[PDB]
Amino acid sequence: MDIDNYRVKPGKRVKLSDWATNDDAGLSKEEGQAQTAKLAGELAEWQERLYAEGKQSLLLILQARDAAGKDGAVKKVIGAFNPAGVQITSFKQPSAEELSHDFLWRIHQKAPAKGYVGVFNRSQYEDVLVTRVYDMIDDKTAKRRLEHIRHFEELLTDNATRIVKVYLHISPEEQKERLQARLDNPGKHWKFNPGDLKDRSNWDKFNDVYEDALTTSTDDAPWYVVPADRKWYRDLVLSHILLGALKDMNPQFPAIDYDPSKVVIH
Amino acid sequence: MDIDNYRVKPGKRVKLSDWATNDDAGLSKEEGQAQTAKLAGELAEWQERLYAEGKQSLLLILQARDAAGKDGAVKKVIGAFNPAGVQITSFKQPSAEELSHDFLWRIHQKAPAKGYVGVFNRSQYEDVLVTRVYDMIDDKTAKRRLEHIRHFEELLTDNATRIVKVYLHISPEEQKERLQARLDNPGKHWKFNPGDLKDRSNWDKFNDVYEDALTTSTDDAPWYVVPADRKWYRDLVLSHILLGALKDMNPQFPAIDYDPSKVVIH
Numbered sequence: 425m426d427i428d429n430y431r432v433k434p435g436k437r438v439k440l441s442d443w444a445t446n447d448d449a450g451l452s453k454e455e456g457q458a459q460t461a462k463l464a465g466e467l468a469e470w471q472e473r474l475y476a477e478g479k480q481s482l483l484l485i486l487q488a489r490d491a492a493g494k495d496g497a498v499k500k501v502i503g504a505f506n507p508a509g510v511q512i513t514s515f516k517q518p519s520a521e522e523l524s525h526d527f528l529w530r531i532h533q534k535a536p537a538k539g540y541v542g543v544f545n546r547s548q549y550e551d552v553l554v555t556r557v558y559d560m561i562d563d564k565t566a567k568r569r570l571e572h573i574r575h576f577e578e579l580l581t582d583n584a585t586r587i588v589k590v591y592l593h594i595s596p597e598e599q600k601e602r603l604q605a606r607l608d609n610p611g612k613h614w615k616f617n618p619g620d621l622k623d624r625s626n627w628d629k630f631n632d633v634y635e636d637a638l639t640t641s642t643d644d645a646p647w648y649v650v651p652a653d654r655k656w657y658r659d660l661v662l663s664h665i666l667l668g669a670l671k672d673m674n675p676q677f678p679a680i681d682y683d684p685s686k687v688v689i690h
Numbered sequence: 691m692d693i694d695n696y697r698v699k700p701g702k703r704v705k706l707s708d709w710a711t712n713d714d715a716g717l718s719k720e721e722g723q724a725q726t727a728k729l730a731g732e733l734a735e736w737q738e739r740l741y742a743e744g745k746q747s748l749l750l751i752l753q754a755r756d757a758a759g760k761d762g763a764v765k766k767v768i769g770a771f772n773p774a775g776v777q778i779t780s781f782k783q784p785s786a787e788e789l790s791h792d793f794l795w796r797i798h799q800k801a802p803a804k805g806y807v808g809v810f811n812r813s814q815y816e817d818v819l820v821t822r823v824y825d826m827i828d829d830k831t832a833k834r835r836l837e838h839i840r841h842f843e844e845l846l847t848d849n850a851t852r853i854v855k856v857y858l859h860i861s862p863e864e865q866k867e868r869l870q871a872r873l874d875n876p877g878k879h880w881k882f883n884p885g886d887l888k889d890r891s892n893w894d895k896f897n898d899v900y901e902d903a904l905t906t907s908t909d910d911a912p913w914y915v916v917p918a919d920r921k922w923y924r925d926l927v928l929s930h931i932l933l934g935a936l937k938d939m940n941p942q943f944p945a946i947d948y949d950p951s952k953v954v955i956h
């Protein structure tokens with residue numbers, strides 16, 4: 425498996441219909457789940473080093489259509505970290521107070537502190553996604569917002585916040601099956617809403633604006649297009665992406681001023 | 691396994707030396723962990739109902755000496771919940787801004803919203819624990835702070851915030867072994883701190899101030915004294931305490947405004 429094949433290279437426009445939704449890297453589900461469990465132990469150790477060092481941060485941004493696995497990826501993969509070192513924000517419809525500020529005001533508030541992992545389940549990119557499809561903003565505004573988003577990510581990068589953006593890529597048939605499973609389950613009815621159907625009738629428009637959003641992929645702030653039809657494969661790929669980032673960040677335990685083997689506990 | 695025997699009944703003062711630190715209810719680690727795994731599924735389901743209902747909240751407060759298992763309890767038990775529905779705060783030494791306010795200002799800010807589980811890893815009780823042992827405040831101030839804490843918990847209860855306070859109870863010998871394991875393990879040296887030895891020399895003074903703090907136990911805002919020398923037993927007992935609270939709160943899925951069998955997904 426080469427996860428760099430899922431990275432959007434800078435300057436290369438994405439045509440999503442040419443990107444796989446259903447990869448398995450030749451692995452069975454059981455092999456994939458076992459590898460994910462092993463990576464979870466490494467994710468925990470590297471995140472503990474990140475916290476103890478207190479010099480850098482990691483920001484994971486998740487965007488995806490409804491039912492494409494944002495909630496599941498956070499549970500399964502972000503669940504590998506110590507929850508004391510993680511701040512997860514699920515960005516919903518802007519409140520009245522948030523709308524009275526610039527669109528990055530509420531986003532910047534949640535940028536992670538030194539030593540922490542930040543996770544945006546939805547993010548600044550919502551302001552150039554649904555808002556474009558339903559004509560809440562026009563193209564001129566959307567282009568300007570994408571520029572402001574690039575500048576914001578450059579600001580965080582220079583603050584030693586390592587940025588990873590992940591689009592979970594599922595097929596329309598797979599989304600239909602997952603949405604049907606919500607309708608069928610009385611304990612999941614509360615998660616099906618009329619907007620689900622409206623967004624499906626705008627599937628191709630959403631492709632267009634997601635492909636515009638993916639143009640912010642840079643070497644410092646990459647987008648990944650993760651094939652997510654197989655939930656276990658989504659979790660495996662995301663685990664690799666996050667572990668590669670942490671290993672590259674290479675946090676170190678701080679120096680200590682004593683010899684641990686000589687400490688006497690009474 | 692009668693969890694209510696660990697509850698501090700109102701007005702019944704605790705003498706911690708008479709409470710066991712190392713119960714196992716006749717279970718092994720394998721047996722206890724299998725029960726905890728089955729309770730985790732039930733915790734996830736009841737927390738999803740709490741969130742979907744959006745009317746009530748759950749607040750878990752943890753206090754314990756260093757190495758007594760706050761971090762582990764949060765990972766193992768709170769990890770059963772969907773992290774999208776949980777807010778964990780690890781309260782550290784008050785900042786200059788926090789000290790310029792009353793002691794409950796920073797605590798009140800983190801009280802949970804409707805639909806959420808809040809976890810205070812340390813809490814308002816720190817202001818009547820370490821502060822008393824080292825004479826940062828006197829008895830008169832400490833008694834007044836305990837009254838304000840009582841009043842604060844009453845305010846949250848009346849807001850349908852279900853309060854559970856948990857003291858993790860370990861023996862001095864157990865703490866010594868766990869601290870030694872930090873000294874012995876290169877990946878854990880960073881968690882050994884000079885305060886560890888100073889507080890041990892003040893073990894009995896801390897018993898006194900914890901027993902005073904435990905007097906805020908009420909039917910509405912109970913303290914539990916959990917035998918925590920066995921880490922798996924700590925997790926089993928805490929799982930029961932939280933599941934009992936959620937089942938009693940009895941959150942209901944909300945009514946929906948459509949017929950799921952009549953929805954047609956194209």
Ligand SMILES: Nc1ncnc2c1ncn2[C@@H]1O[C@H](COP(=O)(O)OP(=O)(O)OP(=O)(O)O)[C@@H](O)[C@H]1O
Binds near residue numbers: 489516555
């Ligand atoms: N800046 C924004 N402008 C408009 N809508 C936004 C913005 N940020 C988030 N939203 C919307 O808020 C809603 C949150 O809905 P909810 O928490 O119920 O999840 P959801 O419907 O399952 O979302 P998703 O479609 O991403 O899976 C989503 O429809 C999302 O598109």
Ligand SMILES: Nc1ncnc2c1ncn2[C@@H]1O[C@H](COP(=O)(O)OP(=O)(O)OP(=O)(O)O)[C@@H](O)[C@H]1O
Binds near residue numbers: 489490738741772
């Ligand atoms: N158990 C839960 N506790 C708290 N919030 C939850 C829970 N289940 C779902 N939610 C929230 O309800 C909304 C709808 O859930 P949904 O399953 O669509 O999640 P999601 O994060 O949008 O993922 P997906 O990409 O699969 O749609 C989201 O805002 C999610 O955060």
Ligand SMILES: Nc1ncnc2c1ncn2[C@@H]1O[C@H](COP(=O)(O)OP(=O)(O)OP(=O)(O)O)[C@@H](O)[C@H]1O
Binds near residue numbers: 782
């Ligand atoms: N209100 C408060 N006043 C003074 N000290 C406080 C207060 N709240 C928290 N603290 C202290 O902040 C410190 C946080 O330290 P740290 O995060 O390293 O954890 P720790 O040393 O493992 O804590 P613990 O002894 O609770 O296990 C603790 O020593 C705690 O007692």
Ligand SMILES: Nc1ncnc2c1ncn2[C@@H]1O[C@H](COP(=O)(O)OP(=O)(O)OP(=O)(O)O)[C@@H](O)[C@H]1O
Binds near residue numbers: 472508509755757759
């Ligand atoms: N992997 C981690 N990521 C983030 N914060 C961590 C991590 N490990 C420990 N911490 C924090 O560092 C401090 C010391 O850790 P420690 O293991 O003593 O935890 P704790 O919550 O105090 O538990 P205990 O009751 O066992 O002392 C605490 O503030 C803890 O929350």
Ligand SMILES: Nc1ncnc2c1ncn2[C@@H]1O[C@H](COP(=O)(O)OP(=O)(O)O)[C@@H](O)[C@H]1O
Binds near residue numbers: 696704
């Ligand atoms: N698990 C326990 N371990 C040790 N002592 C306890 C425990 N539970 C209660 N006690 C002590 O026993 C005495 C009476 O407790 P109480 O809560 O009235 O018992 P119950 O309600 O079960 O009859 C008090 O001194 C109390 O501190």
Ligand SMILES: [Mg+2]
Binds near residue numbers: 491
């Ligand atoms: Mg969704």
Ligand SMILES: [Mg+2]
Binds near residue numbers: 755756757
């Ligand atoms: Mg500690």
